[PDB]
Symmetry: D2
Subunit: 388 residues, 4 copies
C-alpha cells in the first residue's frame, strides 16, 4: 500500500524550494547552492511533473545578455532530457535592496517603473518556456509604520501596475494569466492584500479581471489564523483559483513553509478533498523549505514526503466520500438541504408563506440535532485509516 507519484499527478516544485540554502534571519546557509540543472533531474527522478521559478532563480541578477542565454539554454536542455514542464513563473521583486520599500507600490517612482520592466522581461521568458500562469507575490508591498504608506495611493499604483501588465500580455497576444499570491505579513510589518479575500476584491477593480486569479498558500492564510479550505472554497466559487501553493504551517507565527502535510494535518485533509471534489486541474505546486538542519539527502526526502502526503490524503478523502455510512451521515446533517435553493419559489411566494414565519414552529426546529459530531468522527476515522 505505497503511494508512488507520477507526472500525471501534476506535482510541481519551485527552484527556490529544494534550492533553499537555509539562510534565516538568525543564521547562515547550511547547504551549498544547487545548480538548476541538478534540481530538474533530481525532481524528475522523484516523479515530479515540472518546476517553477523566479527570474532571479534561473538567471543571476545583473547577468549579461550573453550569460542570460547560456543559463536558459542549459535549463532548456534539462527539461528536454527529462520531459519536465514549466507551468508557472514569477518575478523576484523582494531580494534586491532596491525593492526595500516595495516593487509596484514603492514610494520612489523610478523604482516602480524598473519593477514593471523587470517583470515584463520575465513574462516574455515565461511564455518562451511554456508557462501558463504568472504569479505575483508582493513581499515588499507594505510598511512598518502608519505614515509610511498611503494605502489608498498604494492601491492605485498596484492597480496601475497590474493593469499595465494586462495590456502588455493582450498586446503581445500571450496566452498567459496572472495569479496574485496574498500574504498577511513578513518580511514587511503589514503586506498589502494580506488574504485571499483582499486579493479577490482587488482583482474586481482591474480593467480586465478575467485575466487575474489567485495563488493562495496554505501557510500564508494560516498566518492570519484563517481556514485555508474555506478560503479556497470562496476562490473556487468566484472561479479565481488559477494556481495554488501547498505546504505546512504550525499555527500563527513566521512563515515556516514546511513540507505539505506538516502543521495542520486535518486542514490538509479537508483541502485535498475540496480540490479533488471541485475538480481542480491546476498543478499541485509545493512552496516549501527543507529544514536547514538537513543535508542534500534530507532535502530530497522532504520533497518526496510532500507528494506522498498528498497521495495518502487523496486516498482517505476519496474513501470518506465513497463510504455509504458517510453518505447517510451527510444526509442526517442535512448537507443535501444546504444544496437546495432557499426561495426558488421567489420573493413574493416567500413573503406569502405562513409556514416560514406566521406558522413556523421554531421550538421544534431548534430541537433538531445537527449530528455534526458523528460526521466528524467518521471523517476522523477515515483519515487515520481506522474504520471500525
Amino acid at each position: 500500500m505505497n503511494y508512488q507519484p507520477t507526472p500525471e499527478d501534476r506535482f510541481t516544485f519551485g527552484l527556490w524550494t529544494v534550492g533553499w540554502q537555509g539562510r534565516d534571519p538568525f543564521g547562515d546557509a547550511t547547504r551549498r547552492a544547487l545548480d538548476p540543472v541538478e534540481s530538474v533531474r533530481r525532481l524528475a527522478e522523484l516523479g515530479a511533473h515540472g518546476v517553477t521559478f523566479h527570474d532571479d532563480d534561473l538567471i543571476p541578477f545583473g547577468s549579461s545578455d550573453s550569460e542570460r542565454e547560456e543559463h536558459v539554454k542549459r535549463f532548456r536542455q534539462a527539461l528536454d532530457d527529462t520531459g519536465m514542464k514549466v507551468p508557472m513563473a514569477t518575478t523576484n521583486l523582494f531580494t534586491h535592496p532596491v525593492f526595500k520599500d516595495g516593487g509596484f507600490t514603492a514610494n520612489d517612482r523610478d523604482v516602480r517603473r524598473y519593477a514593471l520592466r523587470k517583470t515584463i522581461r520575465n513574462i516574455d521568458l515565461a511564455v518562451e518556456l511554456g508557462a501558463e500562469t504568472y504569479v505575483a507575490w508582493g513581499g515588499r508591498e507594505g510598511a512598518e509604520s502608519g505614515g509610511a504608506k498611503d494605502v489608498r495611493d498604494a492601491l492605485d499604483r498596484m492597480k496601475e501596475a497590474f493593469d499595465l501588465l494586462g495590456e502588455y500580455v493582450t498586446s503581445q497576444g500571450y496566452d498567459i494569466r496572472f495569479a496574485i499570491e496574498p500574504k498577511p505579513n513578513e518580511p514587511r510589518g503589514d503586506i498589502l492584500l494580506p488574504t485571499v479575500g483582499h486579493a479577490l476584491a482587488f482583482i474586481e477593480r482591474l480593467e480586465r479581471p478575467e485575466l487575474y486569479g489567485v495563488n493562495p498558500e496554505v501557510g500564508h492564510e494560516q498566518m492570519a489564523g484563517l481556514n485555508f479550505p474555506h478560503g479556497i472554497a470562496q476562490a473556487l466559487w468566484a472561479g479565481k483559483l488559477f494556481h495554488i501553493d501547498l505546504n505546512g504551517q504550525n499555527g500563527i507565527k513566521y512563515d515556516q513553509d514546511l513540507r505539505f502535510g506538516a502543521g495542520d494535518l486535518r486542514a490538509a485533509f479537508w483541502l485535498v478533498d475540496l480540490l479533488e471534489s471541485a475538480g481542480y486541474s491546476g498543478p499541485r505546486h509545493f512552496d516549501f523549505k527543507p529544514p536547514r538542519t538537513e543535508d542534500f539527502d534530507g532535502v530530497w526526502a522532504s520533497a518526496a514526503g510532500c507528494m506522498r502526503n498528498y497521495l495518502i490524503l487523496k486516498e482517505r478523502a476519496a474513501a470518506f466520500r465513497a463510504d455509504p455510512e458517510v453518505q447517510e451521515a451527510l444526509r442526517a446533517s442535512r448537507l443535501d438541504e444546504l444544496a437546495r435553493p432557499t426561495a426558488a419559489d421567489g420573493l413574493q411566494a416567500l413573503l406569502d408563506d405562513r409556514s416560514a414565519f406566521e406558522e413556523f414552529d421554531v421550538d421544534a426546529a431548534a430541537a433538531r440535532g445537527m449530528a455534526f459530531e458523528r460526521l466528524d468522527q467518521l471523517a476522523m476515522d477515515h483519515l487515520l485509516g481506522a474504520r471500525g
Copy 2:
C-alpha cells in the same frame, strides 16, 4: 483643553452596547437589564447623536403584534423627546437556538426561509424609524468541523439571501443600503466572510453590488492579526465603507469589544486620521461592551470615554497633518511620489524608456534612505502631545 462631544460629532451607540448585562461564557449577568428608553435618555445627555439596534433588542422575541407596537411607541417618544436618530438597524440571527447552525446559510431550508422573513420584517421597521443603513452580521454562519458545511453551497445560499433582500428593498422603493460585518471566528469555529477582504469580494458577486457595502469592526479585523487602518483604506478605495464599528481589542483572542481607544492605541490614531482625511461622513458607531466588573456608573463612564478618545485622537491627527515639519518629512519619504502615476506616459513609452531599465542605476536607488523612522517618531510625538 477638554473634549465635549456633540450631536454634530455623529457618535452613535448600539442598544446592546451600554445595554450589555455582562453574561459571559463563564459567568452570569452582573447588571440588570436597561430599558431602551433609559438608554436613549442617558446617551442623549452624554452628547450622543443616535442609537442603533437589533430587532430583538427593541422588541422581545415572541412579542405579539400588540406588544410590538407598544415597544416601538415608547421608543419613538424617547427619540422625539431627545432628538436622537436611528441611523442603523440590524437583525438578531444568532441568539435564538433556532439559529444554532446559522441564519442565511443554515443547513435546514425551513430555517433559512424563517431567517429571511425575520429580517425583512425588521427592514420595514428600520425604514419607519429612519435608518439609512442595514447591517448584517452572520455570527452563526460557519462551522466547527470540515464536513459540516460546504462553503461552495453555503456561499450560494448567502448570495441568494442577500440577492432577495436587494429585490425586496428595490421593490418597496426603500432608500436603505446593506452593510455586511465580517468576523473571523466566534461564536463559530470559523465564520464565513471572515475579513473585510472576503466581504468585499463576495459583494462583487451580488446581483446589485451597488446596494451592498461593509461595516468593519476594529476588534474583528484585529482578531485575525490584520491592520485595521489598512483594511479600512481598501474599503474606502472600493467605495464600500457604508458604516463602521469602533472599539478596542488586545491583540489576537476572543472578542473583547473594549471601549474605543483601548487595546491598540496607535492603530486607533491611524484609523481616526484616515477617517478624517478621507472625509468619512458616516456615523461613528461604537460596538463596545462595558466590563462586567463595572456598575451602571461605570457603564456611562465607559461610553463617555469612547467619544472622548475619538475627539482626542482626532485633534492629534489634525495637528500631525498640519505640522509643516511633518509635511516636509512626508516629502522626504517620497509620500508625494507615491501619488504620481507610475507610467502615465503609457506602456509603449515605458517599454522604450532606457532610464527605467537599460540605464537604471539600481545601486544608487537602493542606497536612498526612506526616512520612515523620523516620520514615525514625529507621528508618535504628536500622538503623545509631546512636540519638542
Copy 3:
C-alpha cells in the same frame, strides 16, 4: 480493528463537559440540563472510569444544608450502582457575579475570604467522595486594564490563598494534592499564571511546593500558540504533572474545548506518545464541550469520540516506537546522543579538552545532516497507518 474503552483506561469526564447546556456569549442554551445521576450512568455505559465536578456542579448555589446532603446522597448511590470513581474535584470561583473581579485575588478582601471558605468546604466533600487531586482554575484572576490590578500584590494574595489551603489539608491530615490549571486569557483580558511555565514557577514560591502540581489543558496552552507536548514534557521533568485536561483547539482564538483529537491532530499524537512513554498514570481527563449544534445523541457521540481518538493515537504511537526502522532513524538523528551527558568528565576535563575547541572541526560537524525530515515522515506514515 475497533477501540473499546474500558474503566482500566482511566478515562474521566467533568460533569460540566457532557453537561454543557450550550450557552455562549452570543447565544442561549440549546440543550436541557442533565441530572448528574444521568450523566454518571451514561458515561459508565460508555466505558468511562469516573467523573469530576465543581462544587456548584453537584450542589446548586445557595443550596441549604438539607438540600446539599440530598444532592450528595443521590450522586453517591449512582457511583455505587455503576462503580465510577471521583478522582478529581474543583471549585467554581468564576460563575457567580461575586467573583467578577476574581476569587483569591479579588480586590475586595471580604470576597477573597469568602472564596477560601467556599473552597475549603468543597475540599472536605472532595475527600469524602474519594478525590485524590483538587484542581484550581483561576478563571477570574486577572484584569482588563493595566491599573486595575497590581500583579505584585495579586501574586501575594494568590500565594497566601494556596499557602492557607496547604495548611488546612495538612492540618486535617488529608491525602489530597493541589493542581493549578493555567489559562492565558478569557474570560478576563489577561489571567494570572497564563501558561504551564508561569504556574510551575509560582509553585516554587509556595511554603509547601510538594503539595502543588499542574493541570495543563491542551486548548489553553494552544491559546498562546505554545507547544503542548513541550509544555507537558517540562512539567514531567519537574515532576509536577499531577493531572491533565484533554481536548481540542483550532489554533489561536477563544476556548473551543473541542473533543480530544480535534484541532491539532499531530500535537495530539505527540502528546499521547509522551504520556505513554513517560508512564503517566494519572487519569485521562476530558475537559471538552459538545457543540451546541448537537442534541443529546450528539453529546454522547462526542464523548465516545474522545476515548476512541486517544486509543487510536495510543496504538499508532506504540507502533511508531516499536518499529525498528524508526529505532534506526532515531539513532541516525542522534536521539541517543542527546541522552548522554555533555560533560560527565567534569568541568576541568572539558576545559582541558582540545577536541572540544582548539582542535574541533566545526566545518565537518556543521555538514552533518540531522535527518529529521526522514524521521518525521516515518512518524507521519505511522499516524496515518500508512506504512509503506
Copy 4:
C-alpha cells in the same frame, strides 16, 4: 518640553542593534557593516550609557589569538575615549551552521561541548570588560518536528550546561550573574523555555538558582500573545529580573524588534510605570532593529527615538501616580484592599469567621462596581497628556 537622555538614564544598546545590516529571510543587506568603534562613539554622542555584545559581534568568527586582542584593544580605547560601559555580554550560539540543531541542547554531543567552551571563553572576556550580567538566548534550542527532540532529555542537557557555567564562575570567583532570555519560536519551530514563566521555573531546578535570573524581551512575550507588564511583575515578585530588553512588537507574528515605544504603546506605558515604581535599577537595554528601509541617518534617528519614548512614558507614568484624582480612583477600585493580607488572622480564625461565609451577603458584595473604567480613562488621559 524636551526629553534629553543622559548616561545617568542607564540606556544601553547592543552592537547588533544599530549594527544590523538589514539581512532578512527574503532580502539582502541594505546597509554596510558598522565598525564597533563607530557605534560606540555615535551612541555616546546620543547620550547612551553603554553597549552590550555577542562574542561574534566584537571578534569575527575564526579570529586568531592575535586578531582577537587587536579587536578588543580598539574597542577598549573607544570605551575609554567616551566613558561608555559594558554592563552585559552574551554568546552567539545561533549564527554558525554548526549550531543548526542548537548549542547547549544540540543532539550531537561534540557540538554541545564546543558550545560550552565557546561560551566560557566569552564569559572571561565579559568579566575583563566589566560586564555584570551574562545573557543566554537559546535561539537554536528547539525543533521543527515532534520526534526530533526529547524535551525531557533536552532539559537535562540544558540544566547540565547552566550548572557547569555556574561552577566555572564560582570557581573563578567571578562577580557575574546569568540571565536567560526566553522566546516562543523563531528561528526554530518551537524554542525551549518559550516564556518568562518557563525560564523562571527551569531556573528553580538549577544547582545554584541564586546565580540565574531572566532577561525578558517586550517583543518575545508578545509573540505568544502574553501581557509583558504582567510577565515582568511575576519576575520582580520572584526577584529574578536581572536584565531586560526593550523594543516594539505588532501583535503576534515574526520578531519585529521595532524601536521601543512602537507596537503596543499602552503596554509600554504600563511597563515603564512598573519598572519605575518597582525601583528597577538594571540597565534599560534596547534590543531593536532599525528598519532596512532606512539609511545610516535613519538608524541613529531610530535609536534616539527609543530613549526619547522611554523618557516621555516615564514622565506620564509619574504624573499618573502623583495625580490625587488618580490616587482617589485607586482607592475607589480597592487597589489598597488588594494590598492587605487575606487572612492575617490565620486559618482557624478564618474558619470560625461567620462573616466570611455563614453570614456573608454575596448579593451586596457582587453589586459593588469596580470602577475600573474610570481609572483606565484617567490613565489614558495622562498618557495622551490630555488631562481635562
